[PDB]
Amino acid sequence: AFASLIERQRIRLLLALLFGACGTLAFSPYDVWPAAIISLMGLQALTFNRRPLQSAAIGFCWGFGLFGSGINWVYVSIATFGGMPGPVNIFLVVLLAAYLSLYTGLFAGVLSRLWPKTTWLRVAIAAPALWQVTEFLRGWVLTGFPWLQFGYSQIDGPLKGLAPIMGVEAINFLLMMVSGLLALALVKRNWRPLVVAVVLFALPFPLRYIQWFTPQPEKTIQVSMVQGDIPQSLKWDEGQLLNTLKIYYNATAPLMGKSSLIIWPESAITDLEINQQPFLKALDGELRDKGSSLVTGIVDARLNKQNRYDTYNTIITLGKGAPYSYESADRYNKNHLVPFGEFVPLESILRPLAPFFDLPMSSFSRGPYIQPPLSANGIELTAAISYEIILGEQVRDNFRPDTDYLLTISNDAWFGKSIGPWQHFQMARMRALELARPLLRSTNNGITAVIGPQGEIQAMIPQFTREVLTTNVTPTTGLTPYARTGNWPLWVLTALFGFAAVLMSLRQ
Numbered sequence: 001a002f003a004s005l006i007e008r009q010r011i012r013l014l015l016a017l018l019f020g021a022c023g024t025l026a027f028s029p030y031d032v033w034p035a036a037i038i039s040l041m042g043l044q045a046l047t048f049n050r051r052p053l054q055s056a057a058i059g060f061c062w063g064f065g066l067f068g069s070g071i072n073w074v075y076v077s078i079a080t081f082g083g084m085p086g087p088v089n090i091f092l093v094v095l096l097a098a099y100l101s102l103y104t105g106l107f108a109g110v111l112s113r114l115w116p117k118t119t120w121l122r123v124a125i126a127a128p129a130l131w132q133v134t135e136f137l138r139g140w141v142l143t144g145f146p147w148l149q150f151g152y153s154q155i156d157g158p159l160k161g162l163a164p165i166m167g168v169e170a171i172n173f174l175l176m177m178v179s180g181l182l183a184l185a186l187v188k189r190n191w192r193p194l195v196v197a198v199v200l201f202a203l204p205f206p207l208r209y210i211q212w213f214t215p216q217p218e219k220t221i222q223v224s225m226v227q228g229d230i231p232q233s234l235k236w237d238e239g240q241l242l243n244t245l246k247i248y249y250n251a252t253a254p255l256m257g258k259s260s261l262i263i264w265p266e267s268a269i270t271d272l273e274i275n276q277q278p279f280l281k282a283l284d285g286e287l288r289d290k291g292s293s294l295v296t297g298i299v300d301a302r303l304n305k306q307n308r309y310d311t312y313n314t315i316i317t318l319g320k321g322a323p324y325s326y327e328s329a330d331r332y333n334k335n336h337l338v339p340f341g342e343f344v345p346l347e348s349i350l351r352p353l354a355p356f357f358d359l360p361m362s363s364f365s366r367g368p369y370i371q372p373p374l375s376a377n378g379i380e381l382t383a384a385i386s387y388e389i390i391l392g393e394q395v396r397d398n399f400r401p402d403t404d405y406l407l408t409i410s411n412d413a414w415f416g417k418s419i420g421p422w423q424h425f426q427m428a429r430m431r432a433l434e435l436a437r438p439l440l441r442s443t444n445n446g447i448t449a450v451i452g453p454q455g456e457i458q459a460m461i462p463q464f465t466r467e468v469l470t471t472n473v474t475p476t477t478g479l480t481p482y483a484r485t486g487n488w489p490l491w492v493l494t495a496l497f498g499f500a501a502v503l504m505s506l507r508q
């Protein structure tokens with residue numbers, strides 16, 4: 001009796017959660033990319049033949065089914081490092097999933113208000129355009145949080161070659177268009193939208209065999225990222241500062257003279273750069289003598305015009321090809337700070353409330369949006385500290401044509417053994433794919449890997465293990481169409497589809 005059961009409001013809301021939860025089965029840990037299409041079909045099929053205010057509830061439940069069932073490793077960072085009652089920890093995660101679901105409830109509500117009837121216009125020209133706008137708002141409002149975008153799920157899939165041409169957000173655009181036409185063919189029991197939903201999904205397949213980069217087997221350095229595996233509950237303690245420096249230095253010494261580039265995780269030196277001055281100067285001379293360059297994440301307290309200490313999450317460079325100096329330009333201050341982890345809203349009421357809102361060294365300051373690429377031993381590194389690697393447009397803007405490797409240092413020790421480090425790792429692979437540059441990802445204990453110029457994992461060391469990822473990586477030169485253009489060509493298509501769909505909605 002499913003013919004009349006589907007029309008009930010409650011049955012569609014509960015089906016929204018199941019199709020919403022099926023979305024998380026497309027990301028890095030469970031890499032079933034078909035689950036991205038099935039989940040998106042549920043968002044569009046379940047909102048068919050619904051009033052505008054009823055589709056918003058369905059869209060909210062689909063979002064809550066995806067962002068509370070696939071973004072819940074935030075609970076690990078709350079229940080293990082912030083001191084709060086258990087119900088309070090659950091409430092924040094639920095609130096985060098509820099907040100992120102508004103931009104999906106907004107999508108479905110507007111979609112069923114301007115395009116009530118179910119047709120190819122609603123699913124293929126209206127939904128992809130409105131999905132881009134609502135996804136953009138989720139990634140722009142309150143500093144944004146562009147997590148769980150189905151474009152990242154196609155890192156190893158048919159829609160792989162589309163990212164180098166128009167970016168990851170184009171895969172989000174195409175997945176929504178294909179899924180909508182796929183759900184239209186199922187609800188209306190038609191076959192013409194099914195054929196279109198296959199042609200649009202098979203045309204970008206040959207694009208994955210096009211290489212926009214020319215590899216250079218001449219600058220083949222031997223990079224070696226040192227995974228310190230420093231516990232997060234002890235990383236910023238005073239008594240661990242001497243120990244953590246010894247752990248990294250001892251592993252770095254055999255690498256000197258044989259590894260051209262050595263990379264340490266984010267905030268590897270937990271002390272202020274001005275405080276740890278003699279250690280860096282002594283380390284710089286040893287690295288330069290043997291012919292090795294070190295890239296390190298450190299905390300800085302650079303002075304400002306107002307003579308106020310503005311703490312920055314920086315990257316310093318030492319050794320050959322980049323002499324270390326406190327006034328050197330080979331730095332990278334972190335720009336997009338993580339909310340509630342690096343900055344606290346208004347820093348006035350929330351911080352005294354709970355220890356979670358007052359984390360060790362969580363009063364950072366933003367840096368310039370565009371910064372020069374790091375230079376180390378004659379290679380240009382485009383840095384992106386941790387969270388910044390998920391921001392495709394910010395990385396592209398800093399991406400100079402002379403960049404040899406994409407650099408990313410992260411500290412994923414917060415999110416336990418959960419799927420958070422993997423989802424973050426999958427997004428980092430997308431940057432290498434669309435910019436056609438090798439990605440040298442280094443983490444405290446997370447997934448340390450050398451992503452190839454196509455999103456392939458050239459090397460990786462086991463997680464939660466204090467190891468060193470010594471490997472040979474060949475830099476690539478060449479500009480992808482995404483690097484040369486960016487997000488504007490997609491927004492023209494969004495505006496072209498959005499303006500050609502709103503007018504056809506006001507016509508009737």
Ligand SMILES: CCCCCCCCCCCCCCCCCCCC(=O)O[C@H](COC(=O)CCCCCCCCCCCCCC)COP(=O)(O)OCCN
Pocket residue numbers: 074077092093095096099141142143144145266267313338339340341342359360361362363386387410411412414424
């Ligand atoms: C009406 C709406 C109001 C807000 C609704 C939301 C509800 C708020 C409460 C729920 C959200 C809580 C999020 C807590 C995240 C804490 C984990 C951050 C730890 C961290 O920053 O580590 C850094 C690594 O970056 C990373 O590894 C980044 C990993 C990916 C981001 C993690 C999740 C971010 C969630 C952002 C939520 C934004 C909501 C609004 C859009 C570097 O760490 P370090 O070693 O340098 O040490 C520095 C410690 N100070």
